[PDB]
Structures are given as C-alpha cells and as structure tokens.
C-alpha cells in the first residue's frame, strides 16, 4: 500500500529510497545490444546519465533500449506536489504500441527528478526506456 507521499512496502519517501540506474543502453535512441529484460525490477528507481532521466511519454520503435518490446509511459509526468501517481506503461510490439501493459507509479521529487516504481515486466524481452531528449 502507498499513499500520496509515502510508499508502505516500512513506509518511506520514494524520493529518498530508490535504486539509481546509469544505463545509457536504456535510451530510446539505442537500437543495438543483446536484448535484455527488466523482469527483475522491484521498488523505486531513478534514471540518470546519457540515456536520459525520464521515461518516454511517446511510443518507442521496436528493438530499442536494448530490448525487443520497449516500454513507454502512457500518461503525463506529475509535478512536485502531485504525490505518487498511478500510470499505465505500454510495450510496443508487432505493430501495437501497447501489446503488453503494466502499472507503474511515478513521483516528482525535490531537486528536479522523478522516481518510478517498476515491478518486473509483463513479458520478455521488455525494458523501461529512457528518453535522452
Ligand atoms: C528502502 O526500501 C527497501 C525496499 O523497499 C527496504 O528494504 C529498506 O528498508 C528501505 N529503507 C528505508 C530507509 O526506508
Ligand atoms: C495512452 O495512449 C493512447 C494512444 O496513444 C491515448 O489515446 C491515451 O490518451 C493515452 N493515455 C494517457 C493516460 O495518456
Ligand atoms: C492503479 O489504478 C488501477 C485502475 O484504477 C487499479 O486497478 C490499480 O489497483 C491502481 N494501483 C494501485 C492502487 O496501486
């Protein structure tokens, strides 16, 4: 269970307890590499580095982000003060920009970053992309 500002899974502020990922291969512009899968993700994550600091809000082309079906945010990012928000993540595959979908949580944080709660993936090979733009 999570609330407006804290996640209880005891309760903590996601902006102060997340996993930091600096993985440029996650970029929506990276179409290379051996496809991997974010099946092992759990809890809250922050993305930094040249691959970008945010999930894409637009459908990503297949075979990007070092995966087969790249996953993007079927929603709009929250602002600081909006609390933890409920969103759908969509995987693009086989002509279908939401071939698979799963729930993700998003929170805006003091200091100008977002954190994402990512609980595995619905299929493999799927990954949560970052937009370097
Ligand atoms: C951070 O989150 C992890 C997993 O949710 C938990 O095991 C750990 O106790 C948390 N730490 C703090 C300080 O909240
Ligand atoms: C998700 O994407 C579809 C198609 O691109 C769009 O119609 C819908 O409004 C989007 N939902 C949100 C919450 O952004
Ligand atoms: C997010 O919203 C969906 C649709 O209302 C719901 O099924 C899901 O349980 C929500 N996630 C939560 C409350 O963590």
Numbering used by the authors: 41 to 49, 58 to 181
Provide the publication's sentences verbatim.
To address these questions, we first expressed in mammalian cells the whole GP2 branch as well as the corresponding region of UMOD and assessed their ability to selectively capture the lectin domain of FimH (FimHL) from an Escherichia coli periplasmic extract. This showed that, as in the case of UMOD, the branch of GP2 is sufficient for interaction with FimHL. We then obtained crystals of the GP2 branch, but experimental phasing of its 1.9-Å-resolution data was hindered by relatively high diffraction disorder in one direction and low crystal symmetry. The electron density maps reveal that the GP2 branch is a protein module (henceforth referred to as ‘decoy module’) that consists of a β-hairpin stabilized by a disulfide bond (Cx48-Cy59), packed against a globular ‘D10C’ domain with a new fold including two 310 helices, nine β-strands (βA–βI) and five intermolecular disulfides (C163-C8157, C285-C9172, C3107-C6145, C4113-C10177, C5138-C7146). Interestingly, although the GP2 branch also binds FimHL, its D10C domain cannot be glycosylated at the position corresponding to UMOD N275 (R165). In agreement with these considerations, introduction of an N65A mutation in the decoy module of GP2 impairs its interaction with FimHL and mass spectrometric analysis of the glycans attached to N65 detects the HexNAc2Hex5 oligomannose structure, indicating that UMOD and GP2 exploit a common molecular strategy to counteract bacterial adhesion. Because of 60% sequence identity to UMOD, the crystal structure of the latter immediately explains the effect of many substitutions affecting invariant positions. Remarkably, most of these mutations cluster within two structurally important regions of the decoy module, the β-hairpin/D10C domain groove and the disulfide bond-rich region at the opposite end of D10C.
Glycoprotein 2 (GP2) and uromodulin (UMOD) filaments protect against gastrointestinal and urinary tract infections by acting as decoys for bacterial fimbrial lectin FimH. By combining AlphaFold2 predictions with X-ray crystallography and cryo-EM, we show that these proteins contain a bipartite decoy module whose new fold presents the high-mannose glycan recognized by FimH. The structure rationalizes UMOD mutations associated with kidney diseases and visualizes a key epitope implicated in cast nephropathy.
